[PDB]
Amino acid sequence: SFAQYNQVYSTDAANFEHVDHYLTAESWYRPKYILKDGKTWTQSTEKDFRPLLMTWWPDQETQRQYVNYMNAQLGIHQTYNTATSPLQLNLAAQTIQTKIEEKITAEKNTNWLRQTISAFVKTQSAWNSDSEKPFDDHLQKGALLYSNNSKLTSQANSNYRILNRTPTNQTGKKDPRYTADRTIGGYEFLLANDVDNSNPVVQAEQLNWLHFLMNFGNIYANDPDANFDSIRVDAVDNVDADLLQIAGDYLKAAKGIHKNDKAANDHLSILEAWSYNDTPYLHDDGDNMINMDNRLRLSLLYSLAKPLNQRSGMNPLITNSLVNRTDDNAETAAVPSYSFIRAHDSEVQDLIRDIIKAEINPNVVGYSFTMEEIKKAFEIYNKDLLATEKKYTHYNTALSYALLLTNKSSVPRVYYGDMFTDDGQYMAHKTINYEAIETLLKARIKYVSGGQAMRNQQVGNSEIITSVRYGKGALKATDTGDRITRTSGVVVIEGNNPSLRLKASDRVVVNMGAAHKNQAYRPLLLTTDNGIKAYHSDQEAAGLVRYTNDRGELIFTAADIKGYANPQVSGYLGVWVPVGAAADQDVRVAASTAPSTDGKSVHQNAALDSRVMFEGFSNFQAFATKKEEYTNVVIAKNVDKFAEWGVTDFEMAPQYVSSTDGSFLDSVIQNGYAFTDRYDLGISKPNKYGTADDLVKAIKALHSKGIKVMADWVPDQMYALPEKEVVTATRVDKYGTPVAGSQIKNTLYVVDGKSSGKDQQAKYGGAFLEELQAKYPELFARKQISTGVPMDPSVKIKQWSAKYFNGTNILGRGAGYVLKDQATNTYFSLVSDNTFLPKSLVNP
Ligand SMILES: [Ca+2]
Numbered sequence: 001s002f003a004q005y006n007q008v009y010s011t012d013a014a015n016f017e018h019v020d021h022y023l024t025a026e027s028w029y030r031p032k033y034i035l036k037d038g039k040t041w042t043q044s045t046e047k048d049f050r051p052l053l054m055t056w057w058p059d060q061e062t063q064r065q066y067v068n069y070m071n072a073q074l075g076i077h078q079t080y081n082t083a084t085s086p087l088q089l090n091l092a093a094q095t096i097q098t099k100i101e102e103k104i105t106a107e108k109n110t111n112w113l114r115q116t117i118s119a120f121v122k123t124q125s126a127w128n129s130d131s132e133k134p135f136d137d138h139l140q141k142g143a144l145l146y147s148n149n150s151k152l153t154s155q156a157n158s159n160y161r162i163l164n165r166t167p168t169n170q171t172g173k174k175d176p177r178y179t180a181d182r183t184i185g186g187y188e189f190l191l192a193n194d195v196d197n198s199n200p201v202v203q204a205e206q207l208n209w210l211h212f213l214m215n216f217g218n219i220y221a222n223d224p225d226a227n228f229d230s231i232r233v234d235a236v237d238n239v240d241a242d243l244l245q246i247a248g249d250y251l252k253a254a255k256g257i258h259k260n261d262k263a264a265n266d267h268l269s270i271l272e273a274w275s276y277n278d279t280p281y282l283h284d285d286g287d288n289m290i291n292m293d294n295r296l297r298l299s300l301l302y303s304l305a306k307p308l309n310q311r312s313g314m315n316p317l318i319t320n321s322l323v324n325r326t327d328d329n330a331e332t333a334a335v336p337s338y339s340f341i342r343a344h345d346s347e348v349q350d351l352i353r354d355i356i357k358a359e360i361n362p363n364v365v366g367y368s369f370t371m372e373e374i375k376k377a378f379e380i381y382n383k384d385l386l387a388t389e390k391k392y393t394h395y396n397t398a399l400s401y402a403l404l405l406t407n408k409s410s411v412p413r414v415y416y417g418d419m420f421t422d423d424g425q426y427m428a429h430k431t432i433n434y435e436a437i438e439t440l441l442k443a444r445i446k447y448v449s450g451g452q453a454m455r456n457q458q459v460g461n462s463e464i465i466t467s468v469r470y471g472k473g474a475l476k477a478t479d480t481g482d483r484i485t486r487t488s489g490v491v492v493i494e495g496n497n498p499s500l501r502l503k504a505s506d507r508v509v510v511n512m513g514a515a516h517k518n519q520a521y522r523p524l525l526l527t528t529d530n531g532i533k534a535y536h537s538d539q540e541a542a543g544l545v546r547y548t549n550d551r552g553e554l555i556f557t558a559a560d561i562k563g564y565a566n567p568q569v570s571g572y573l574g575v576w577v578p579v580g581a582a583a584d585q586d587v588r589v590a591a592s593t594a595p596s597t598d599g600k601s602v603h604q605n606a607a608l609d610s611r612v613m614f615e616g617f618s619n620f621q622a623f624a625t626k627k628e629e630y631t632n633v634v635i636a637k638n639v640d641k642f643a644e645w646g647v648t649d650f651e652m653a654p655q656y657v658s659s660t661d662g663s664f665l666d667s668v669i670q671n672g673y674a675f676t677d678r679y680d681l682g683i684s685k686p687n688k689y690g691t692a693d694d695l696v697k698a699i700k701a702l703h704s705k706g707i708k709v710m711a712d713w714v715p716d717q718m719y720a721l722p723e724k725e726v727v728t729a730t731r732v733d734k735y736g737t738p739v740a741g742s743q744i745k746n747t748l749y750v751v752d753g754k755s756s757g758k759d760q761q762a763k764y765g766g767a768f769l770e771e772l773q774a775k776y777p778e779l780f781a782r783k784q785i786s787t788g789v790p791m792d793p794s795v796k797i798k799q800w801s802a803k804y805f806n807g808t809n810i811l812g813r814g815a816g817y818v819l820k821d822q823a824t825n826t827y828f829s830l831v832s833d834n835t836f837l838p839k840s841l842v843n844p
Contacts, residue, residue: 002094003844005033005041006055011837013830017049019750020153020726021830023819025121027052038102049110051117052819054097056838059822060086062124067092069120074099126816131743136733139366140663140809143189143732146802147746150728152827156753156802162198163188163736163806165240165786167273167281172786177284178277185275186237189734191664192674192719193753194806197240200792202804203784204769206715207246207791209678211768213711214254216681217696219764225703226696228711229267232651233289234673235716236273241281242784243715244271246791248288248601253776257288257601261591264602266708268411268611268649270338279322283335287600293337293410296321300341300403304496305394308570314465314496318454323409325467328452329475333409333604340413341400344619344653348417349665351392352377352620358392367665374620374669378423386432388565395570398436398532402492402525402575405440405612406469408452409604413613413651414441422618426631426689427638432567436525439534440575441612441645443524447490447577449587449606451475453511460502464561464572467492470513471578472587477513477552485515487581490524491554493561495572500563508556516552520545520579527569538579545579588646612646613710617653619671623688630690632682636701643705650702654712655681655695658688659720663809667719672712674719679760718800723754726818727802731810748818748827751811753802766796 009015009030016029028049036042057063061082067089068079076095080088104110121127135141148158168175168185178185188194196202210231212219217226233247247269251257257264269289271282279291299316306312318325322337342348349367355377356364364373384393394400397418404412419437421429449472456465471489473481491510512519522541526533535541548554554576563572588610602608617631624630631653635642642650656675659667667674670688677684682692689695702709729749731742738745755761773780773793780790797804819828821838829836 002035002055002097003840005035006031006841007844008032008837008841009044011830011835011842013832016830018830019724020155022726022748023052023828023830024750024817025053025124025127025819026118027819031055035097035101037105038098051113053117053120054093054100056841058816058819060089063089063093065124066120067096069123070096070116073116074103125814127814129810129812129814131815132731132810132812134739134741136739138189138734138809139191140368141365142739142810143194143734143807144727144729144744144749144751144810145732145736145807146805147728147730150746152748153726153728153802156725156727158196158199158803160199160787161196161806162240162786165198165242166237166275167241167244168275168277170241170785175277175281178280180276183275185277187734188238188736188806189732189809190235190238190716191666191809192717193721193751193808194717195239195715196804196806197243197715198786199804200784200787200789201795201797203242203246204791204793205765205797206243207250207772207779208764208766208768210247210250210713211254211772212679212764213713216711217699220681220683220692221696223696223700226699228699229708230269230649230710231713232269232710233271233273234654234712234714236271236278237275239716240786242786244282244285244289245782245784246779247713248286249779249782250776251288252601253779258286258596260593260595261603261605261607262593264596265591265607265611268602268608268708269710270613270651279335279337283600287336287602290336290338290411290602293322293339296339296410297341297346300400301347304396304399304494304571305341305347307390307395308498311496314463314494315456317403317465318456325407325409325452325454328408330409331475331605336602336604336608337410338413338613339404339407339410340415340615341397341404342394342415342418343413343615344415344417344617344671347394348422349619352381355380355392368663369665369668371668378620382421382423386567388567396496396568396573397433398525398568399494399496399571399573401433401437401440402494402573403467405444406448406467406490406492408469408609411608411611411613411649413615414645414647415615417618420618423620423622425622425624425629426634428629432531435534436532436568438645439524439536443490443575443577444612445588445646446581446585447471447488447587449473449488450481450485450513451477451479453477455510457508459506459508460500462495462497462500462563464493464495464500464508466508466510467494468510468512471515474513474515477511479514481515484585484587486519487578487585488587489513489516489578491576493556493572493574495561495563496570498563498565498570500561500572502558502561504558506558508561510554510556512548512552512554514552516548516578517550519548521547521554521576522579523574524577525573525575527564527573528566529564530566531568532573546576611648613649613651614642614645614647615651617671617689619665619669621669621688623670624690630686630694631688632690632694632698635698636694639701639705639707642702642707647707649708649710651710652698652712653689654714655687655689656714657682657685661720663719673714675714676718676720676722676755677759677761678718679764683760721752721754721800722756723752724750725753725802727751727753729807732807736806743815747815749815750813750817751802751808753800753805753808755800757799761800762798765798766793769793769796
């Protein structure tokens with residue numbers, strides 16, 4: 001009869017390991033007595049906690065499963081089938097308790113018991129991911145949505161959790177103005193703990209953090225020179241779009257970006273917003289930041305980079321873009337944008353997924369790779385980059401960069417991993433395209449200016465495109481300009497088919513513009529049998545001069561243009577520049593301080609086009625071995641290169657210390673997107689890129705060359721929060737819709753949902769709001785679109801908890817982990833006025 005001894009020492013909450021006054025399958029508790037060393041019933045002390053599952057079970061079948069399991073762990077030989085009597089099971093459990101206590105004494109610890117109990121727990125369906133099925137296509141197989149109104153978990157109640165309020169669906173109804181993306185333009189649950197960005201208190205906290213990032217130097221190091229200048233908005237299509245008005249309002253109120261282009265261009269901030277509706281929405285919102293040109297990205301991808309037999313026609317390079325470049329003669333383009341072909345995730349982690357799925361692990365889930373899978377995949381990927389026939393990696397990267405780097409009316413963004421290997425130490429190894437890219441970047445400072453014309457010509461058995469910049473001061477082909485128009489401008493010629501052959505009578509006649517009659521040109525880049533040859537000066541290309549005729553036309557023939565197939569080129573690339581630019585010729589233009597008057601902040605004119613963004617990291621960089629390999633230490637050492645390349649905006653990796661849970665790629669390669677503490681920029685320990693002091697130094701080094709530095713602002717989610725919390729939860733898909741056939745619907749669930757209360761969030765959270773409301777009261781007077789109300793700065797978030805989150809990815813804890821009385825279907829509880837405990841533990 002152990003029931004008397006094992007009864008609870010008392011009903012005080014302090015006697016149990018509870019979470020918000022609920023018990024869980026893994027809760028331990030203090031009994032009245034302990035069977036010391038298996039032999040002597042002895043009054044417990046405060047240290048004498050033991051698992052609830054040693055003395056209590058939720059039903060007879062769970063007691064059987066516990067006995068059979070613990071017998072196997074403890075070398076007790078008997079197993080019990082379903083016909084076993086209640087008596088046999090109770091005796092067996094008491095025998096088990098006996099052995100447990102001999103073993104606690106012999107081994108001087110209870111950690112072993114912690115481990116066997118937790119392992120037992122995970123064998124039960126009600127306590128593992130089996131009761132969290134069916135799964136759905138969320139990246140981590142499912143989400144849990146926290147209930148707004150629940151008497152069981154009133155501390156996690158909310159009046160908000162307004163979901164899927166993307167730019168397209170900001171008002172809860174698809175916007176009728178934007179029709180190129182017919183969906184609702186994104187979805188609320190992406191990864192990990194999903195932050196409730198419709199909560200006005202959470203919105204003020206995202207503004208606090210934005211302000212922190214943009215005064216990072218002032219706040220952390222007292223150095224007005226180590227501040228981030230601009231931001232990237234991460235995962236726009238997964239958060240409430242009110243944040244876009246908040247960040248734009250902040251840029252305007254704090255930095256004056258709406259006053260003149262000099263101010264806007266010193267703080268040029270971008271969105272990562274993939275819906276086609278996001279660009280026109282951002283334009284109507286005031287061009288307070290710029291978005292990607294996703295159409296053009298797709299055209300470069302399918303016209304140039306795809307496997308030969310999947311490759312489209314070339315005309316989309318001209319017309320399938322935010323800007324039709326057939327004839328782009330505008331002083332200011334209709335909408336600003338940035339343009340890229342690959343980014344740290346886009347067309348990098350997808351290709352690693354393709355490799356693993358095809359050759360290594362065919363059941364890999366989403367991008368939840370292991371480090372071992374990644375390393376094996378890189379063996380296959382790095383070979384493929386060097387081959388002429390590529391199975392998995394991009395073709396024609398140089399052709400894509402020649403268009404990106406000469407196009408008018410978009411800021412190009414160069415991806416770090418197109419110049420340096422995607423894996424390996426920062427900047428330690430150059431790709432085979434590094435030299436072609438660097439030559440384009442340097443020629444771009446010197447030659448790329450004026451209006452643009454693109455032509456598509458069908459020739460021989462295929463087609464080419466030609467792309468011309470007329471030179472600084474000539475927006476149209478008829479403009480004559482002056483001396484510097486004459487020595488600037490560029491022509492790019494491309495084909496995308498290696499069997500391209502011209503007839504003997506074919507000509508590609510290219511109008512260079514009226515500044516360029518009767519003139520010597522020389523090659524910048526030519527395709528060759530094995531690669532691409534780069535010419536770094538007029539002299540280096542001295543045997544290869546050609547001329548324009550009376551009319552300002554260069555004319556090309558079969559002798560110049562044919563299709564090749566080599567590691568760099570599948571098709572054709574030729575680029576020519578006018579002879580005789582001075583060594584330091586620079587055709588870029590600085591922004592004006594004249595006041596803006598069109599109601600837009602950022603303007604796609606010659607000053608914005610003079611800019612180049614560099615996305616300065618790869619997800620798959622190796623981990624540093626020593627101080628000198630840290631990314632931020634290496635950026636500071638090589639700041640001269642970025643300036644030589646004309647980089648004007650350096651997009652650094654998010655700098656938050658990474659969590660290490662491994663539940664998704666970001667927290668396996670620790671890029672900085674999966675983090676527990678938003679304000680921990682290499683402060684508590686190094687991030688992947690160095691210490692907070694290395695970050696300070698890289699930002700100062702970039703500033704000493706006039707280069708602006710972008711903070712990646714990541715409001716969508718947080719990972720691996722250290723403290724447990726009980727919520728009332730429903731299994732939902734990535735939009736928040738309840739999953740059909742699930743067992744978890746308004747049922748209690750223990751999430752990892754609170755931050756420590758003692759980290760950088762606790763020090764800075766809400767710390768600037770008083771100052772922000774004094775200096776910029778207009779930020780706080782907007783009534784935000786999704787909620788209809790202003791931000792609410794009256795509460796500081798020093799500790800995150802479930803009330804500020806929409807939900808979480810499913811955790812594999814099971815539908816029944818919070819314990820219940822099966823007889824009455826009522827949760828056990830330790831709240832003092834309302835205590836409800838297993839009867840056999842309080843009244844044996
Ligand atoms: Ca979200």
